[PDB]
Backbone:
């Protein structure tokens, strides 16, 4: 049952399986555009960073999910959990509620202090309109589906994180007070 989940998850094979899954979607997709001659957008590229970043999180996390490393790897998993989900919303709202500013659509704005984009414009430079539909499943745009996965991934980490032995009665001090006010 649940206990087993912690067993299968605490295994590397399982972790490696999570990577191939997120990758399989990127590859199988990288082919659709290669033939469908599809072009990425500003947001699309940004969203790719949210997951692409997580993928890297699964590579380092699968190093030893039995040590405090959890907080270390989940740091990226969670970052995408709240932000990834919150962002995925902007796409949905705008998609069903188109009303942008003047011409905010001005390529990707990033500080020249991070050659991550300058030294690598290949997977950063945007080209095309954002929110446009070029391919859908069951009558749903990819962005909508991909979001479906984001939720799934958000659950495996939140559940696998809490699956930790937890318990422990010690826990000396935890959280500041400061609420006595003043006369």
Residues:
């Amino acid at each position: 049952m649940l206990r087993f989940l912690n067993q299968a998850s605490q295994g590397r094979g399982a972790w490696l399986l999570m990577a191939f899954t997120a990758l399989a979607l990127e590859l199988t997709a990288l082919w659709f555009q290669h033939v469908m001659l599809l072009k990425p957008c500003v947001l699309s590229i940004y969203e790719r960073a949210a997951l692409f970043g997580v993928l890297g999180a699964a590579l380092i996390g699968a190093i030893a999910p039995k040590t405090p490393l959890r907080y270390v790897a989940m740091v990226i998993w969670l970052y995408s959990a709240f932000r990834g989900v919150q962002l995925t919303y902007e796409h949905t709202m705008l998609q069903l509620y188109p009303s942008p500013f003047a011409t905010s659509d001005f390529m990707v704005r990033f500080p020249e202090w991070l050659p991550l984009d300058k030294w690598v414009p290949q997977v950063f430079v945007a080209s095309g309109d954002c929110a446009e539909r070029q391919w859908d499943f069951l009558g749903l745009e990819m962005p909508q589906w991909l979001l479906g996965i984001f939720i799934a991934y958000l659950i495996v980490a939140v559940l696998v994180v809490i699956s930790q032995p937890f318990k422990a009665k010690k826990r000396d001090l935890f959280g500041r007070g400061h609420h006595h006010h003043h006369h």
User: Anything to note?
Assistant: The domain at 1-183 is CATH 1.20.1550.10 (Bromodomain-like).
